[PDB]
Amino acid sequence: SQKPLSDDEKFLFVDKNFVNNPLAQADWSAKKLVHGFEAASIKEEKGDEVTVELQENGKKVTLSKDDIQKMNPPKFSKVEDMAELTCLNEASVL
């Protein structure tokens, strides 16, 4: 549950990921952050021919938009409610 005094609830007390900075778009690539998908930055978008800067892989790779869905800002990663994401793609829900 929600007890920050007990890790026994911290296996449920949700550590929704964040950037610890008052900006919210520096964690999800405004191009597209990226079945543990590979949070990334589109460097060259040619359709799905998307060399995302695979920031979870560090790879400017033409990668599947299967991985490159709206992996919403990691500020919405590991959230209680998946609905807290920008777009609830399992690129981010997952």
Partner: protein, 99 residues
């Protein structure tokens, strides 16, 4: 809320001006969160830099005021060179001894 919506330059369609909350579907929610966060950064840092200068302002010194004062002394010296010579220093006097 509709005010800060038009100030967001939007209107609720994937969010909702309701009765108690702007209910957010997936979408406009975190987009608006991102806009809010960006502008929070903006206004924080803007006040911080304007505040650094600002705090030099509050912080100048009292040498500030003594310098302004010596400037006023220069002004009054120029003023006595201004009026006490020509007949505009004796054109309201010499009569109030009888007024």
């Amino acid at each position: 809320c509709i005010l800060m919506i038009k100030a967001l330059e939007l209107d609720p369609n994937l969010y909702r001006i309701g009765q108690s909350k702007i209910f957010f579907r997936t979408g406009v929610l975190a987009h608006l969160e991102e806009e809010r966060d960006l502008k929070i950064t903006d206004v924080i840092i803007a006040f911080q830099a304007q505040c650094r200068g600002y705090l030099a302002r509050k912080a100048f010194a009292k040498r500030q005021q003594q310098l302004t004062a010596m400037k006023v002394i220069q002004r009054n010296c120029a003023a006595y060179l201004k009026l006490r010579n020509w007949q505009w220093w004796r054109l309201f006097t010499k009569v109030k001894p009888l007024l």
